[PDB]
Short mmCIF file of all heavy atoms in Angstrom, two decimals:
data_model
loop_
_atom_site.label_atom_id
_atom_site.label_comp_id
_atom_site.label_asym_id
_atom_site.label_seq_id
_atom_site.Cartn_x
_atom_site.Cartn_y
_atom_site.Cartn_z
N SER A 1 -34.27 20.06 26.35
CA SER A 1 -33.72 20.09 27.72
C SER A 1 -33.73 18.68 28.25
O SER A 1 -34.79 18.09 28.44
CB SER A 1 -34.52 21.02 28.60
OG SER A 1 -34.33 22.34 28.15
N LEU A 2 -32.56 18.10 28.41
CA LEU A 2 -32.37 16.73 28.80
C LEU A 2 -32.30 16.45 30.29
O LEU A 2 -31.43 17.10 30.88
CB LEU A 2 -31.04 16.46 28.02
CG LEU A 2 -30.84 15.03 27.65
CD1 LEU A 2 -31.97 14.63 26.71
CD2 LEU A 2 -29.49 14.81 26.90
N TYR A 3 -33.05 15.63 30.95
CA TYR A 3 -32.98 15.25 32.37
C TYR A 3 -32.55 13.82 32.55
O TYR A 3 -33.09 12.88 31.89
CB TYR A 3 -34.29 15.53 33.14
CG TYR A 3 -34.54 17.00 33.11
CD1 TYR A 3 -35.02 17.65 31.97
CD2 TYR A 3 -34.24 17.81 34.22
CE1 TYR A 3 -35.20 19.02 31.89
CE2 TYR A 3 -34.44 19.18 34.15
CZ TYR A 3 -34.92 19.80 33.02
OH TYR A 3 -35.12 21.15 33.02
N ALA A 4 -31.54 13.60 33.40
CA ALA A 4 -31.02 12.25 33.66
C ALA A 4 -31.83 11.69 34.81
O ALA A 4 -31.66 12.23 35.93
CB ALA A 4 -29.53 12.27 34.08
N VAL A 5 -32.67 10.72 34.62
CA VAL A 5 -33.43 10.17 35.75
C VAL A 5 -32.89 8.77 35.91
O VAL A 5 -33.33 7.88 35.14
CB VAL A 5 -34.96 10.27 35.57
CG1 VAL A 5 -35.67 9.63 36.77
CG2 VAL A 5 -35.39 11.67 35.22
N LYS A 6 -31.98 8.58 36.87
CA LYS A 6 -31.36 7.27 37.00
C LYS A 6 -32.19 6.31 37.86
O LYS A 6 -32.42 6.57 39.05
CB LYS A 6 -29.92 7.40 37.59
CG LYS A 6 -29.14 6.09 37.70
CD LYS A 6 -27.65 6.47 38.00
CE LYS A 6 -26.91 5.17 38.26
NZ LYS A 6 -25.45 5.51 38.35
N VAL A 7 -32.61 5.18 37.32
CA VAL A 7 -33.44 4.11 37.89
C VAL A 7 -32.85 2.70 37.75
O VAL A 7 -33.31 1.70 38.31
CB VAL A 7 -34.90 4.23 37.36
CG1 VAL A 7 -35.60 5.57 37.49
CG2 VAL A 7 -34.92 3.77 35.91
N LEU A 8 -31.75 2.61 37.00
CA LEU A 8 -31.02 1.41 36.69
C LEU A 8 -29.57 1.53 37.14
O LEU A 8 -28.99 2.54 36.82
CB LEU A 8 -31.01 1.04 35.19
CG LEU A 8 -32.27 1.15 34.35
CD1 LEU A 8 -31.96 0.81 32.90
CD2 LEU A 8 -33.27 0.15 34.96
N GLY A 9 -29.10 0.46 37.74
CA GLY A 9 -27.74 0.36 38.23
C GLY A 9 -26.74 0.00 37.13
O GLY A 9 -27.14 -0.20 35.96
N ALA A 10 -25.50 -0.16 37.56
CA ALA A 10 -24.33 -0.53 36.75
C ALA A 10 -24.58 -1.81 35.93
O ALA A 10 -24.07 -1.84 34.80
CB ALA A 10 -23.06 -0.75 37.55
N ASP A 11 -25.33 -2.76 36.49
CA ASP A 11 -25.68 -4.00 35.78
C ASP A 11 -26.88 -3.86 34.82
O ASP A 11 -27.22 -4.84 34.13
CB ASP A 11 -26.02 -5.08 36.80
CG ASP A 11 -27.22 -4.73 37.65
OD1 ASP A 11 -27.91 -3.70 37.66
OD2 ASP A 11 -27.51 -5.57 38.52
N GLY A 12 -27.54 -2.72 34.76
CA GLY A 12 -28.66 -2.57 33.83
C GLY A 12 -29.99 -2.94 34.45
O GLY A 12 -31.02 -2.70 33.79
N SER A 13 -30.00 -3.51 35.64
CA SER A 13 -31.26 -3.85 36.31
C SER A 13 -31.65 -2.73 37.29
O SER A 13 -30.83 -1.90 37.69
CB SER A 13 -31.17 -5.19 37.00
OG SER A 13 -30.53 -5.11 38.29
N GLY A 14 -32.91 -2.74 37.69
CA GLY A 14 -33.44 -1.75 38.63
C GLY A 14 -34.73 -2.35 39.24
O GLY A 14 -35.44 -3.14 38.59
N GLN A 15 -34.97 -1.96 40.48
CA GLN A 15 -36.19 -2.44 41.16
C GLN A 15 -37.41 -1.69 40.63
O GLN A 15 -37.22 -0.51 40.26
CB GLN A 15 -36.00 -2.18 42.67
CG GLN A 15 -35.20 -3.31 43.31
CD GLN A 15 -34.86 -3.04 44.77
OE1 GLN A 15 -35.49 -2.20 45.43
NE2 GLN A 15 -33.88 -3.78 45.28
N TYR A 16 -38.63 -2.22 40.65
CA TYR A 16 -39.81 -1.49 40.24
C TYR A 16 -40.02 -0.18 40.99
O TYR A 16 -40.40 0.81 40.35
CB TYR A 16 -41.10 -2.34 40.30
CG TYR A 16 -41.37 -3.05 38.99
CD1 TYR A 16 -42.39 -3.97 38.78
CD2 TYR A 16 -40.55 -2.74 37.90
CE1 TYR A 16 -42.56 -4.64 37.57
CE2 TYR A 16 -40.72 -3.39 36.67
CZ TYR A 16 -41.73 -4.33 36.50
OH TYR A 16 -41.83 -4.90 35.24
N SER A 17 -39.78 -0.15 42.29
CA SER A 17 -39.97 1.10 43.04
C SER A 17 -39.07 2.22 42.54
O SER A 17 -39.44 3.40 42.69
CB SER A 17 -39.74 0.94 44.54
OG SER A 17 -38.50 0.32 44.82
N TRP A 18 -37.82 1.88 42.17
CA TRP A 18 -36.90 2.97 41.71
C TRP A 18 -37.45 3.61 40.45
O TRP A 18 -37.46 4.85 40.25
CB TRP A 18 -35.51 2.40 41.51
CG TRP A 18 -34.86 1.59 42.56
CD1 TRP A 18 -35.17 1.48 43.89
CD2 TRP A 18 -33.65 0.83 42.37
NE1 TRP A 18 -34.29 0.62 44.51
CE2 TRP A 18 -33.34 0.21 43.62
CE3 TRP A 18 -32.82 0.57 41.29
CZ2 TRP A 18 -32.24 -0.61 43.75
CZ3 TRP A 18 -31.75 -0.29 41.39
CH2 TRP A 18 -31.47 -0.86 42.62
N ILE A 19 -37.98 2.73 39.59
CA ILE A 19 -38.59 3.15 38.30
C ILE A 19 -39.83 4.02 38.56
O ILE A 19 -39.94 5.10 37.99
CB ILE A 19 -38.94 1.95 37.35
CG1 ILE A 19 -37.64 1.28 36.82
CG2 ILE A 19 -39.89 2.40 36.21
CD1 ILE A 19 -37.82 -0.27 36.70
N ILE A 20 -40.68 3.59 39.49
CA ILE A 20 -41.86 4.36 39.83
C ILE A 20 -41.45 5.70 40.46
O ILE A 20 -41.99 6.77 40.12
CB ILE A 20 -42.79 3.54 40.81
CG1 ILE A 20 -43.39 2.35 40.02
CG2 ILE A 20 -43.83 4.47 41.48
CD1 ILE A 20 -43.85 1.16 40.90
N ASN A 21 -40.44 5.63 41.32
CA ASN A 21 -39.93 6.88 41.95
C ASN A 21 -39.47 7.82 40.86
O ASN A 21 -39.64 9.05 40.94
CB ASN A 21 -38.84 6.56 42.95
CG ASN A 21 -39.36 6.04 44.29
OD1 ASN A 21 -40.56 6.30 44.54
ND2 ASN A 21 -38.54 5.48 45.16
N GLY A 22 -38.82 7.25 39.84
CA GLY A 22 -38.33 8.11 38.74
C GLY A 22 -39.48 8.73 37.93
O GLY A 22 -39.33 9.89 37.50
N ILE A 23 -40.53 7.95 37.69
CA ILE A 23 -41.71 8.49 36.96
C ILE A 23 -42.35 9.59 37.83
O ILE A 23 -42.65 10.68 37.40
CB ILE A 23 -42.83 7.45 36.56
CG1 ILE A 23 -42.32 6.41 35.54
CG2 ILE A 23 -44.08 8.13 35.93
CD1 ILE A 23 -43.00 5.03 35.61
N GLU A 24 -42.47 9.32 39.13
CA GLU A 24 -43.01 10.38 40.00
C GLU A 24 -42.17 11.63 39.98
O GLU A 24 -42.79 12.71 39.99
CB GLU A 24 -43.14 9.91 41.45
CG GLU A 24 -44.17 8.82 41.71
CD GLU A 24 -45.61 9.25 41.68
OE1 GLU A 24 -45.88 10.47 41.70
OE2 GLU A 24 -46.50 8.43 41.59
N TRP A 25 -40.85 11.53 39.99
CA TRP A 25 -39.95 12.69 39.96
C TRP A 25 -40.26 13.43 38.68
O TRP A 25 -40.30 14.67 38.64
CB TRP A 25 -38.46 12.28 40.06
CG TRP A 25 -37.50 13.44 39.95
CD1 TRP A 25 -36.94 14.06 41.04
CD2 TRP A 25 -36.96 14.15 38.82
NE1 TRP A 25 -36.14 15.11 40.66
CE2 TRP A 25 -36.11 15.18 39.32
CE3 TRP A 25 -37.16 14.07 37.45
CZ2 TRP A 25 -35.48 16.08 38.47
CZ3 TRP A 25 -36.54 14.98 36.61
CH2 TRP A 25 -35.73 15.99 37.11
N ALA A 26 -40.36 12.75 37.52
CA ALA A 26 -40.61 13.40 36.21
C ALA A 26 -41.91 14.19 36.14
O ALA A 26 -41.96 15.26 35.50
CB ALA A 26 -40.64 12.28 35.15
N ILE A 27 -42.93 13.62 36.77
CA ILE A 27 -44.25 14.32 36.75
C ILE A 27 -44.14 15.60 37.58
O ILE A 27 -44.54 16.73 37.21
CB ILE A 27 -45.31 13.35 37.37
CG1 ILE A 27 -45.60 12.13 36.45
CG2 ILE A 27 -46.59 14.17 37.72
CD1 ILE A 27 -46.32 10.99 37.28
N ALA A 28 -43.60 15.41 38.80
CA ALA A 28 -43.42 16.56 39.71
C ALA A 28 -42.64 17.75 39.14
O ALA A 28 -42.93 18.93 39.42
CB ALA A 28 -42.81 16.10 41.04
#
């Protein structure tokens, strides 16, 4: 079962908070 957790933009970069928010979403 595949989940798309988007934390990176069109340019391939992402802020640390977006990444942390994504890890928090995954745990929840």
Side-chain angles (χ1 to χ4, degrees):
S1 293
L2 207 63
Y3 298 76
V5 178
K6 183 167 174 172
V7 308
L8 317 176
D11 63 357
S13 82
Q15 277 175 19
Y16 269 175
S17 51
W18 310 342
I19 291 143
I20 291 157
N21 282 340
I23 295 151
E24 293 286 346
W25 177 98
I27 291 163

